[PDB]
């Protein structure tokens, strides 16, 4: 992504910033969530195995 | 070739922000004399009227 001189951020389609300036540095970096996901357990039942 | 304001879609990205913290009501606008103020040409002293 390009930003203009006058842009800092970056937006999605929430309030959390999808992307970012460096203060140090003019270079723009994008941000993603750390991962998350459901852990499904699978089982063919405690009577039959552990 | 288009003597007024043109049909069509520009945005103006900002400049500059002053901190000038005055107060603001009328404004006016400066000009450039190319002719001379002592002496007025008959015509073509300006730019083309
Ligand atoms: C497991 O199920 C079988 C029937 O399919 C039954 O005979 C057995 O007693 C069960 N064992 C336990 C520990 O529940
Ligand atoms: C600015 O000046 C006008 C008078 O011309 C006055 O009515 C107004 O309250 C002033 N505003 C500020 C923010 O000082």
Known sequence: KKFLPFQQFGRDIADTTDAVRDPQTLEILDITPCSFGGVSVITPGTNTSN | ?49
Do not use: C, K
């Open chain 2, 1 to 49: 070739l288009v003597r007024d304001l043109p049909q069509g879609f520009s945005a103006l990205e900002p400049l500059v922000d002053l901190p000038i913290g005055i107060n603001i009501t009328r404004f006016q606008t400066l000009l450039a004399l190319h002719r001379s103020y002592l002496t007025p040409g008959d015509s073509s002293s300006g730019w083309t009227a």
